[PDB]
Symmetry: none
Subunit: 294 residues, 6 copies
């Protein structure tokens, strides 16, 4: 038996990171929609252990066309991942990730970025620990007149979750953000509630309804006022190579979308947003995306 | 077989004193850090049965430089220890300890102190009894318009602990403090919860994670309010002659430290505290300590 | 038979890199001389697969004494070399080289450097491919408001060589340097001619004369003028543990030097430069170096 | 046959360092006497490769009691010695020595010292080369507004010795001290003469007289005057575990001393100095020392 | 072989003390004559290690009869001599001598005297060192408003002698007397010349003439004048138990004397002085002495 | 049967001298304590019949360091003791004692002292007669404008004692002191009462309590007043090489002390005095003494 420097079970006795709380509900509301943009994603791999990914994007509301290119090298025998990246704003950088090299359940990542537009150099060091019933870590952001420290932890028991996230500014030695959350998760549904700085509140519901149907509800409100926001969304698997999705915001905003697999490895997504009830006499938006993986 | 005036097993079937409850977790949070101070510890011994110890200390937040010098004589054949002490505030004194002389598991200590700064004389008499599953005792503080009586006891069973601590003022014939605690201990972990006077509550978790890694969690809260405090700490053995430690407080205070053995008998410790997120724009503190044992 | 991702013969059917063109002639003019400096080179190895190297240096014309220390780890079973480095200007760094891991004849190197004097971080990624009759590659320099791209290639046939070297500045998207070279090589002699940016021209001759005698000639000139420079040098093996060298520059500068093996593994070098014809009534320089390898 | 980076014979075809010239005569005059002080030397070793040494000292003419403690680690397989040190003035430090690691006959030592009394940090780098008929080296002292360079060399032939020592101040770029010496050595006797800066002159004679008798003569004088100083000393082995010594200074100062081995590993030394002819009506001094080695 | 704290040969490779220079010539002129006095010397010894000596004396020119009594104890096993003394002027005292106890050739003596006539107490400490070719020492006289220091040394080579004697007054810190001498000695003759304070000069000749005949010459003169003094003396062994002596002074003073052994252990001496040429019509003097040793 | 000039039995049918009345009680109160002083006692003997004793002493309340040296010669075959003495105040002297030489039970002592500090000479003649049931004698003190006569006698019967002591001044022919005493003695206890000049009264009780325990009581009072003084003391043998003692004075003065034999012939004594009840806020005193007998 190999020795251990830390112990953990297989998922899902290990909780989500703070950032992942509510992810399933969020994916129903976010994935499948691309309103206002045209996106192009080309992914390829080589047997040498290198993956490539290029992502193009055109924003209808700015007229700007942008994109990012990444190359990733996977040292499977070491637990090391090396990434090279470039984008259209001439920002370039390198990322190095370490997994289970120090102790089991430990992930360490170094992110260094440079931008010749100004000559600015900056970066981040991330650390994350996964163990039975706990998911904890911290990102430290190194920049001019920084660093900033972003700590977090989630813990749980018998499907119940709770946790926090805090951001500190070391140039002031002050806390600038303090978020908290609670919830419950199982295979069929997830329930989440949270607060940001004691002022912004909200939550979400994720629910499996049928084998082909995933639904969710988002809630939000602001302390000191009577303003509340909400919405409902769903994703329906039409067939093995097709799906539809839609969502309705309390502000009468209705999103729709459709994804179709054209060929295994090839997926096409179309979507649109309508401003009710003034349609088509308002801010109608459309989107298109094509993804190809080799 | 020698006769007995009291009986006890070898540790650890004998519980910790009330004061020692949670010690392992506390050491992770306290040892290895010296923020704000420079400390110098010189220890020597002689084959005549005398040990000497001198401890220097400089506090960055006051500008004061202080220190203490002690001489200890060990009468190994009698179970008696005699200590002479002096410090920079001109306080001088004598301590006499008696171990297993009266009955097995019994420790008696006499502590007499004098300060020419005022001419004040005061002292303490301590008594502590160790037996199977019980650790009980009392310190009596003799001073002007005293004495005060500080009693305590811890008991346990199959790794479970419980106990109390009480302070009485004999000049009033009243109880002034009443502390309680419960917990569990084993080789791999310790769990402790306590209360002071029914108002201050808290606890701690000690956990061995890996052979080279010791971690802990501290909790605290105050009755009548919603104020809670907490923090997480760890100590990692980098190599046989080096270690690192760190701790994070809920108030965004991050402590770091490093200890290195320079030579067997010689240890160097460096540490610092950063006030997140305003760093370096806040109350940054550093520490340094060197210890030499002959 | 192992598969191949690239093919090459044994040297010397594989040409030198652009940087190595003319190396043999250059070594006669450079090696064996240390005018103006005192140098100390200590090299050691351990059976654990680690090599150490420390190099001290004192420059008579500045009064500065400097040096560098390196540690190298050779993963012979992987084709990987890991280097740690530090120097007197407080520059520190890490280098990782990969050889024949991707495909045969391919060398990849990652060079990361940090200097706390300013907090600056920078580095290089190098790639070099060796194949029958071709030696090609590129160094990319990543820095503030960079990167710079330094490409090169040498090719040949039946002893004949030709190649180029180009430097580009990606922050401008311009070529900044374009060097070209031609030549011929065999066991007994080498002939090289080159040009830098169409303005600086030069070349060299390497010739074996006798078993104990290596000689060479350097030539240079600048476009737009009548200024030419040249010199002649030689190295003579006096005996198995001793050698002498000398060189004469067209500007009447005469270099001399002597190397002696004191013990296998131990070499002592002395040298001097005289400013003719005003000697000793001019800028006379001396040098000394001792190298020990364990 | 192992390779060599330098060559040397066994002693004594390798001369003493400049500092060691006249050492045998000096030991007769210095060793065995401790006038005015009480000294205590405890030395111990452990099979783990660590040696410990503690030295106490009481000076009758100041009333001060002081001392030093050192720990030494011997990496016999590497040629490396690591020393940790502390003393009563709160000065602490580390020394690292390297022997025959670079090349044969080469010794390199790094000495770093810190004193919290002021917070001052300083140190030295030493280099010494031993070869047939030559002993050369240099100590560089790194301090505030330094460094100072202390160079030296001794050479010889057929028992004859000669050499020099020079100190330079790099903050001035000037020589501050220039010492020279000549002499002769054999098994039975040694003759030494020297000069410091052209002003202070002196010398010594060492002579074996009988198997149990070692004698010596010291001479000194100052340029520009008629002032001369001298003295004669001897050491006599009374028996295998006892010896006596004495010395007479031209200023009528007579030193006496006696050493006795009490047990192998245990040595006791007593000594005294009398101011002739006014005895006992003058500055009579006594000394005592005990040394124990385990 | 016993150890040595000092070394010396047997006499006569060790010179006489300053006070002993010329002693042989002086004995011819002094011994055997007792003009003007009657003397009685009784010496006894006991097997217990105690010697006694009583000396009576009557001076014809004063009419006073005096005497001294001494008791001496010889601690042969220690090298210690203890003497008790009393005389007719009521002066009493104690003397302690130490020989070869400290180091070989070293003699130390303590002389304490008391006189109830006045109640005065005073004394001397003497130190004398005998070594090959050197005889050195010092007497320190401790009295009211003293001490006085009387230093001396004699050295020689191949029969040649030279030396000095100086007296200092420590209450003034001045030299009060400075004597010098030179000479030659062998078995057959001795030659001595001296000076006291640069003013008084003189010398003597000792010569063996025949087996039964010892002769000598005394010389003296004073600086600043033409005054010289001299005389010639001789001692003749008449038979094994009888001898005659005589001396003539330049001032026409002729001394004669005769000694006879009456019985072994018993000696009778008669003598007279005649004032030439006015005899018997001048200051004629006679003497008588009897000595008995048991 | 030898003739007798006086007759007496063996002790204790012969009473103590007046000065020895109450000695056992006094020793409990005096011996074992040295408050305020450091004392050093070195005693040696030689087989030649000479004993030496040197006693050093440092008084904390004056800062003066003093001492005495004595040499004693024992003429065992004669009944004669001869003592030579010197001390730090430059007082010197001789003592001669005669025992049983005149008649049995008779002791005669001559004590002569001189001090060069003034030139003063003085002394004493003592005479003491021991017989069945009587102990009588007289000391005569001879000094300037003296002598003084100090007579005494003690007599007894069946354990009962009585006696007197008187001092007369012969320069006045008057009695100056007249002391009287009565008491009882046995092996287990002693009772004593006395009066000095009819004004000072007191007494003591000595009692053996246990084999290892000796106790006593002191009483005193002054005629004409109501002032009384008293105290209680004890000595306890802790073991064959250790003892403790203590005493309490009516004026709240508590003395403590401890003696330990370190080695046969070597004894170490520590002691202290505390001023009750103001401790430690009063005239606390400590003492130390070491005695070595060879």
């Amino acid at each position: 038996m190999a020795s251990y420097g830390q112990t953990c079970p297989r998922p899902m006795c290990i909780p989500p990171s703070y950032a992942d709380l509510g992810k399933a509900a969020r994916d129903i509301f976010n994935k499948g929609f691309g309103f206002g943009l045209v996106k192009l994603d080309v992914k390829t791999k080589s047997c040498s252990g290198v993956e490539f990914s290029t992502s193009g994007s055109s924003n209808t509301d700015t007229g700007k066309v942008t994109g990012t290119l990444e190359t990733k090298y996977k040292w499977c025998e070491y637990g090391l991942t090396f990434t090279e990246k470039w984008n259209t704003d001439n920002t370039l950088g390198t990322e190095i990730a370490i997994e289970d090299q120090i102790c089991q359940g430990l992930k360490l990542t170094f992110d260094t970025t440079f931008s010749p537009n100004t000559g600015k150099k900056s970066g981040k060091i991330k650390s994350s620990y996964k163990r039975e019933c706990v998911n904890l870590g911290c990102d430290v952001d190194f920049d001019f007149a920084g660093p900033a420290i972003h700590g977090s932890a989630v813990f749980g028991y018998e499907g119940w979750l709770a946790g926090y996230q805090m951001t500190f500014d070391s140039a002031k030695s002050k806390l600038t953000r303090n978020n908290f959350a609670v919830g419950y998760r199982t295979g069929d549904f997830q329930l989440h509630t949270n607060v940001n700085d004691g002022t912004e509140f909200g939550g979400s519901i994720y629910q499996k309804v049928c084998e082909d149907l995933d639904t969710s509800v988002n809630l939000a409100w602001t302390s000191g006022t009577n303003c509340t926001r909400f919405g409902i969304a769903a994703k329906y698997q039409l067939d093995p190579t097709a799906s539809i999705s839609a969502k309705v915001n309390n502000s009468s905003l209705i999103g729709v979308g459709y994804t179709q697999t054209l060929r295994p490895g090839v997926k096409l997504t179309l979507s649109a947003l309508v401003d009710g009830k003034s349609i088509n006499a308002g801010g109608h938006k459309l989107g298109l995306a094509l993804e190809l993986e080799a």
